[PDB]
Design a protein around this nucleic acid. Sequence first.
RNA 1: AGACUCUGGCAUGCUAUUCUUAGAGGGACAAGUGGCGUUCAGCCACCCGAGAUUGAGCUAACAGGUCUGUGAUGCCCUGUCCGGGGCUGCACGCGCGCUACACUGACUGGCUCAGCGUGUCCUACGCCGGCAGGCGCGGGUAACCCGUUGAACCCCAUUCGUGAUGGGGAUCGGGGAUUGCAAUUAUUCCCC
Lengths: 125, 55, 25, 81
Amino acid sequence: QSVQVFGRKKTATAVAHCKRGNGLIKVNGRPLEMIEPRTLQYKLLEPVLLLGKERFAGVDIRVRVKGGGHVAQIYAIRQSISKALVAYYQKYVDEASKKEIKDILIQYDRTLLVADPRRCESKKF
Amino acid sequence: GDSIEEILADSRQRSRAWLKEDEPLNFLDPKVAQRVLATQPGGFKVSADGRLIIR
Amino acid sequence: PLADQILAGNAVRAGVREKRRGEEY
Amino acid sequence: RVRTKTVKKAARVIIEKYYTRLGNDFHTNKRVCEEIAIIPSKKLRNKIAGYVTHLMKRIQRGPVRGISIKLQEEERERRDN
RNA sequence: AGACUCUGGCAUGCUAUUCUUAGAGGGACAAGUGGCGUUCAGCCACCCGAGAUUGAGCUAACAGGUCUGUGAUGCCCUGUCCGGGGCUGCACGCGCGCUACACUGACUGGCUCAGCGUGUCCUACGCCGGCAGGCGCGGGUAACCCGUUGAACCCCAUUCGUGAUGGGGAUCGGGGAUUGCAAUUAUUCCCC
């Protein structure tokens, strides 16, 4: 058994699978630390270092992306990971852990649960 | 069909889907189908006594 | 009154002006 | 005979705003039409009363939750005013 | 085959009133029942009910025009194809738009991510030439094939280094190829 979530952006859409495991992080068949724009690598390290790497050793996560640019894909990946962990610890783990994770993750940043509702406005005659 | 608002009505495209974002969404949850929508979400005069005038 | 006129001339008008500028699914 | 569109609109607005005070058969519905609308036309009054009776007969065979929330909203609007 | 307007059948109710009157008020609203029905619009049959419809008034045109029959109708006068040419040719004034005037940059190599459309002209693939481009064979009248639409900016490493300079590319000379009756007044592209 496992949990599938989705992360959204302007045009970048990602899906995320979280299941039992030894703590493997995979994005597009690759680990999280070699996404091509290296400069936002701490963004890819924002969720896990917010929680602690020892806790993630029971969950294996795999994220696939399609659409958007580089940084939009990065934001979709990190938001999808955050919502994957909170959904996994809500459905499978007791409510107190989900509540404290949600509280710390909502006092850190707003976009890590609901993405920024921004899109390009169309041109009309 | 038998609802109140359906009777009182002023009387490709089908492949569109609508997600709703609350609790996080799990695709493998058996009750996720409640959170998806197949369609788009969302004159008379008054007298002194308060009675309407119909003509 | 006289003092009201003097103080209105001594102050600057302010207050109301509505400037009209500028998810779930 | 067919129903005029303004009869349909009047029946809609009457059954939308004052569903609680209307009754089952034709006579009390005509009475509600009497002291809810001045309605100078007798034939228009009769057609409106008959169509409101038919509308509530069709509505009362439906689900109860819509009637319940409609009555709750009507009570809230009456208490607010 | 009037889903226009108005109205009548029964009043032992009111007024000067059960028999004659003439004003007003009730009464019919498809109202109810059973079937045919997209299960809602309508249709058929029947009960109660005086009345589930009987009477009074209501076809007409061509701001598109045509075919060319019309009033010695009124006002004003008494072109064709062919060949080439330029269609802004440039001292200047007045504005739309592109390029950069470098170092946050340029070169090279690697790296990796979208969206709006379209096609018998979009092209997948194999052969030749460094490239401009040819040859051959397929897919597609279309979310199927081009196309998991593999793009640019950005990212990593090298070289360059304050220099009218490896920036910027104008204006030129030559060659080649492509598009077409025809390219000169450089159609267009690649290279030097």
